[PDB]
């Protein structure tokens, strides 16, 4: 009809501008200049950050207990991973009954997807690679949430693997993006038909799963059952493209990094760079969830926020290809 221009304008939110919401005392994290697309903070205040996403790659570490925490690059060791193609994207952590910390990392060596499993060796500041996971039901993985050392839910932001086909898929509005449950002897699709499923996380009691649908501007809440299956419970809508979801383990609150305007993030223009926006969502099961814009700007400081998490009154914000911001709430 040429109501395809209309679908494009709403999916990519092409008219949105950003009302500023300032915080006291924000500082750029020195040494992060090429992306910090996803990050996860352990209960002890150690923060993992994936960087150098292309569409060289590193996992960074900050100790948020420090007054002015510096970043260091974690050393990856092992012979089961080829670091020369390491291209990390979403991450997740899992802490076993023995306090072993596992880090799961979405990796895009070339056009493909894998999920890399590491064991974090705290004293050594290093990651011991353990396993490379790949599967037909993980064609185009964006993020995962770990529920065991090699067990996770994964979003696929596209159905296709080939970037040319992905591009058609996205622009055609097929909405074939889907979510997969992966475990050693049980891999299945758990929800499907998304327009660019992206962020994913879980409530601290393991009973609910949250899935960001980037181009629909939605967060889906699902009940998670004892048999690992998901059923739809509710859908929240926003005026922003929602990217990664972090969950505060104390409250269960969601902290979501967002892209107010889709044009600016998908078609990068240094003269009109993407801005940043962080939402907090409280009481997500109640009749009126409380949604607060905690931080928002047009990118004169931080461009393309994807993720945000809090730790003891500090907010750490990452981006797809730019810097990271550390703020007092």
Give the residue numbers annotated as catalytic, written as ranges.
Answer: 89
Least distance between ligand LMT and beta carbon 6 (Å): 11
Toward Ca ion, which CB reaches closer, 90 or 260? 90
Using DSSP's 3-state secondary structure scheme, residue 165 falls into helix
Toward ligand LMT, which CB reaches closer, 30 or 171? 171
Q: Give the contact letters, 242-261, x = binds to Br ion (CB under 5 A), - = no.
A: ------------------xx
Least distance between ligand LMT and beta carbon 141 (Å): 20
Cβ pair 101, 148 in contact under 8 A = no
Toward ligand LMT, which CB reaches closer, 106 or 175? 175
Please choose, from the candidates 79, 309, 112, the residue with its C-alpha nearest in 3D space to the C-alpha of residue 326: 309
Query: Residue 175 interacts with ligand LMT (CB under 6 A)?
Result: yes
Query: Residue 143 interacts with Ca ion (CB under 5 A)?
Result: yes
172: part of which helix (H) or strand (E)? helix 163-172
Least distance between ligand LMT and beta carbon 14 (Å): 17
What DSSP state is assigned to residue 209? E
Query: Residue 264 interacts with Br ion (CB under 5 A)?
Result: yes
Q: Among 90, 260, 274, 275, which residue sits at the site for Ca ion (rule: CB under 5 A)?
A: 90
Q: Among 139, 275, 304, 318, which residue sits at the site for Br ion (rule: CB under 5 A)?
A: 275
Tokens of 207: 């009973």
Toward Br ion, which CB reaches closer, 129 or 264? 264
Please choose, from the candidates 139, 29, 47, the residue with its C-alpha nearest in 3D space to the C-alpha of residue 93: 47
CA distances, 220 to each of 90, 119, 157, 208 (Å): 18, 31, 15, 10
d(CA 38, CA 139): 19
Q: Among 156, 203, 244, 303, which residue sits at the site for Ca ion (rule: CB under 5 A)?
A: 244
d(CA 45, CA 116): 23
The contact set with ligand LMT (CB under 6 A) reads 172-175
């Amino acid at each position: 009809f040429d109501r395809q221009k209309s679908s494009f304008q709403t999916r990519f939110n092409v008219h949105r501008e950003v009302t500023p919401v300032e915080l006291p005392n924000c500082n750029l994290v020195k040494g992060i200049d090429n992306g910090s697309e996803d990050l996860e903070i352990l209960p002890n205040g150690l923060a993992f950050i994936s960087s150098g996403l292309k569409y060289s790659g590193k996992i960074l570490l900050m100790d948020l207990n420090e007054k002015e925490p510096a970043v260091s690059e974690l050393e990856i060791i092992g012979n089961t991973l080829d670091i020369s193609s390491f291209n990390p994207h979403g991450i997740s952590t899992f802490i076993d009954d023995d306090n072993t910390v596992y880090l799961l990392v979405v990796n895009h060596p070339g056009s493909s997807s894998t999920v890399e499993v590491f064991k974090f060796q705290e004293e050594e500041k290093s990651l011991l690679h353990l396993k490379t996971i790949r599967h037909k039901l993980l064609p185009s993985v964006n993020d995962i949430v770990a529920v065991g050392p090699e067990h996770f839910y994964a979003t696929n932001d596209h159905y296709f693997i080939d970037p040319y086909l992905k591009s058609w898929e996205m622009h055609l509005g097929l909405a074939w993006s889907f979510v997969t449950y992966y475990s050693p002897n049980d891999v299945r699709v758990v929800a499907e038909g998304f327009d660019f499923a992206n962020g994913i996380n879980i409530s601290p009691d393991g009973k609910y799963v949250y899935i960001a649908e980037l181009l629909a501007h939605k967060i889906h809440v699902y009940e998670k059952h004892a048999n690992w299956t998901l059923t739809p419970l509710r859908v929240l809508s926003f005026d922003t493209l929602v990217d990664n979801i972090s969950v505060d383990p104390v409250t269960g609150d969601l902290w979501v990094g967002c892209h107010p305007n889709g044009m600016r993030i998908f078609f990068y223009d240094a003269e009109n760079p993407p801005g940043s926006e962080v939402l907090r969502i409280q009481d997500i099961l109640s009749e009126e969830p409380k949604v607060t814009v905690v931080y928002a700007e047009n990118g004169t400081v931080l461009q393309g926020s994807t993720v945000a998490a809090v730790y003891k009154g500090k907010l750490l914000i990452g981006t797809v290809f730019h810097k990271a911001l550390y703020c007092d709430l």
